[PDB]
Scaffold this active site. Structure first.
Site, short mmCIF file in Angstrom:
data_model
loop_
_atom_site.label_atom_id
_atom_site.label_comp_id
_atom_site.label_asym_id
_atom_site.label_seq_id
_atom_site.Cartn_x
_atom_site.Cartn_y
_atom_site.Cartn_z
N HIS A 200 23.29 -36.38 50.69
CA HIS A 200 23.53 -35.32 49.73
C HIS A 200 22.19 -34.70 49.38
O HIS A 200 21.25 -35.41 49.03
CB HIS A 200 24.24 -35.92 48.49
N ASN A 225 21.17 -30.63 40.69
CA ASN A 225 22.36 -30.88 41.51
C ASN A 225 23.21 -29.62 41.56
O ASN A 225 22.97 -28.66 40.83
CB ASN A 225 23.13 -32.08 40.93
#
Ligand SMILES: [Ca+2]
Ligand SMILES: [Ca+2]
Ligand SMILES: [Cl-]
Length: 265
Positions: A200, A225
């Site tokens: 990720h 994020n």
């Protein structure tokens, strides 16, 4: 400028006028498209550092426009390397406003570029200059792995700080599981080990010093994020740069920087 981002402390989000503070957090939804969000944000901060407006790149265009065999763009994420290849192949990065993101459209046909669309890659060039006395430079990106710096983490930290100062961010790889704990909601500095691998992409956007719950002087990364502005601490989190002493692996698996030429605005 310097009082908000220097070698010891960098948090541009505290300067409401900074171009970078005006790049709002995005929500990738339920597709594995963080590679696009983190890579495009790195270009967005580079554009801010060169004096351009904080205009968002269309993640959906990058997801849907590619050469070659059909790909599984919602279920399977790719890499910053592929992100650059798409730029090379298409030469056009539309603005979010022109082709806005909805995760349910990830995988649809690449749209025609309309006459009124902005090209946020106009006069951009990915650098492939062969400058070092070895054949390995000029890929367009440079990547560093924390495992390769395990005996020299001070140098890994210094590299990242320099790039955050100069480019506004780096791309960083983590294992998504590691930020899934209940405790990642809230404002504390997280402290944990990484894993052998990552899956990720996020961005390191700043850093600072703090004292942990045990009274030890430590440092943290500020990490962006792409899970929307209600995840974590307004879409960001802080994490101890070194983590627990017993860790075999650092929470940050690796970082990537893009090597681009872009004229000052
Ligand atoms: Ca883990
Ligand atoms: Ca590994
Ligand atoms: Cl898919």
């Amino acid at each position: 400028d310097n009082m908000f981002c220097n070698k010891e402390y960098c948090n541009r989000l505290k300067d409401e006028n900074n171009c970078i503070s005006n790049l709002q957090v995005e929500d990738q939804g339920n597709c594995d498209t963080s590679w696009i969000f983190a890579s495009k944000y790195h270009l967005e901060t580079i554009r801010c550092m060169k004096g351009y407006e904080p205009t968002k790149i269309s993640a959906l265009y990058v997801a849907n426009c590619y050469k070659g065999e059909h790909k599984d763009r919602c279920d399977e994420g790719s890499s910053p390397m592929e992100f650059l290849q798409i730029i090379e192949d298409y030469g056009f990065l539309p603005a979010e406003s022109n082709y806005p993101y909805n995760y349910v459209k990830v995988g649809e046909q690449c749209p025609k570029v309309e006459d009124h669309w902005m090209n946020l890659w106009d006069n951009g060039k990915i650098l492939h200059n062969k400058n070092e006395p070895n054949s390995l430079d000029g890929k367009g990106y440079t990547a560093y792995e924390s495992e390769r710096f395990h005996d020299n983490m001070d140098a890994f930290v210094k590299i990242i700080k320099t790039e955050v100062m100069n480019k506004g961010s780096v791309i960083a790889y983590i294992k998504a599981e590691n930020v899934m704990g209940y405790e990642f909601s809230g404002k504390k500095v997280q402290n944990l080990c990484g894993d052998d691998t990552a899956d990720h992409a996020v961005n390191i956007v700043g850093y600072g010093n703090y004292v942990n719950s045990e009274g030890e002087k430590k440092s943290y990364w500020i990490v962006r994020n792409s899970w929307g502005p209600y995840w974590g601490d307004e879409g960001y989190f802080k994490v101890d740069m070194y983590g627990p002493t017993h860790c075999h692996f650092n929470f940050i698996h690796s970082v990537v920087i893009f090597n681009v030429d872009l004229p000052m605005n």
